[PDB]
Design an enzyme around this catalytic site. Structure first.
Site: not given
Ligand SMILES: *C(=O)[C@@H](NC(=O)Cc1cccs1)[C@@H]1NC(C(=O)O)=C(C)CS1
Length: 256
Positions: A39, A135
């Site tokens: 992230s 993914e």
């Protein structure tokens, strides 16, 4: 050998780059070792969004459905019926690591391929965005999709937040969002003395990947830009936030 000790204590591989923008003095440990960026990519993604749009253009409302919701949607799962502005999605991505918010913003700039292209334009030949959530979480050792290096993430975070990839009003929005991050209290923030301002973006992924990128402001002085990346041998491995905190303590020791 303080970084090797942490790798020894936590059974993990550790990727460190720190730049003091005030001395150009550097701290490095496996600085060019590839890790899944997880992230952390969301900070650079808002970077490109801010380049591509006026502040007033962030008020554009995005409509989405349950199909745009993925594995972790703490803000987006709330506003399916109302939609959310690009500014609100930027907030959700940066301050809560809302995965759907990142996907929507990514689709707003024209996808991972379009994000890669803009990252090359700012001087980053290392970061390889390729896939959407969920993914981009699955990175096996040796594969380079959705990976960067401590040096590349620092260089790129500095370029957007601190240099001339953005005008000051847009740098302020990015830095304010990252300063008020809610996900990072156990990581870079936990290795920096109270009162010092920290802007950060966390990440977690497979092979116990546990990442934090930050700008740290001492009370007076120029800021430090820091990446602490980590990964472990086993696909399902757990991470320990304390690795990132301790790695952060070693960096500040080395720079003071
Ligand atoms: C980015 O790192 C994101 N990670 C994932 O979506 C993968 C995982 C889901 C559950 C466990 S791993 C989001 N960010 C963060 C973070 O930045 O800390 C977390 C905790 C998971 S969602």
């Amino acid at each position: 050998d303080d970084f090797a000790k942490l790798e020894e204590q936590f059974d993990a591989k550790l990727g460190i780059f720190a730049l003091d923008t005030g001395t150009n003095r550097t701290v490095a440990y496996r600085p060019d070792e590839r890790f899944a960026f997880a992230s952390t990519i969301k900070a650079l993604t808002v970077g490109v969004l801010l380049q591509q749009k006026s502040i007033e253009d962030l008020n554009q409302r995005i409509t989405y459905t349950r199909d745009d919701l993925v594995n972790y949607n703490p803000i987006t799962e709330k506003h399916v019926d109302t939609g959310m502005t690009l500014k609100e999605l930027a907030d959700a991505s940066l301050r809560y690591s809302d995965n759907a918010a990142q996907n929507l913003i990514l689709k707003q700039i024209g996808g991972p391929e379009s994000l890669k292209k803009e990252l090359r334009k700012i001087g980053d030949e290392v970061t390889n965005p390729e896939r959407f959530y969920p993914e981009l979480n699955e990175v096996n050792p040796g594969e380079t999709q959705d990976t960067s290096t401590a040096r590349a993430l620092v260089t790129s975070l500095r370029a957007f937040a601190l240099e001339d990839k953005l005008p000051s009003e847009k740098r302020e929005l990015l830095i304010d969002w990252m300063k008020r991050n809610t996900t990072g209290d156990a990581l870079i923030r936990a290795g920096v003395p109270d009162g010092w301002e920290v802007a950060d973006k966390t990440g977690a992924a497979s092979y116990g990947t546990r990442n934090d990128i930050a700008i740290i402001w001492p009370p007076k002085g120029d800021p430090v830009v820091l990446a602490v990346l980590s990964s472990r041998d086993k696909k399902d491995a757990k991470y320990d936030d304390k690795l990132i905190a301790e790695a952060t303590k070693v960096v500040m020791k080395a720079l003071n």
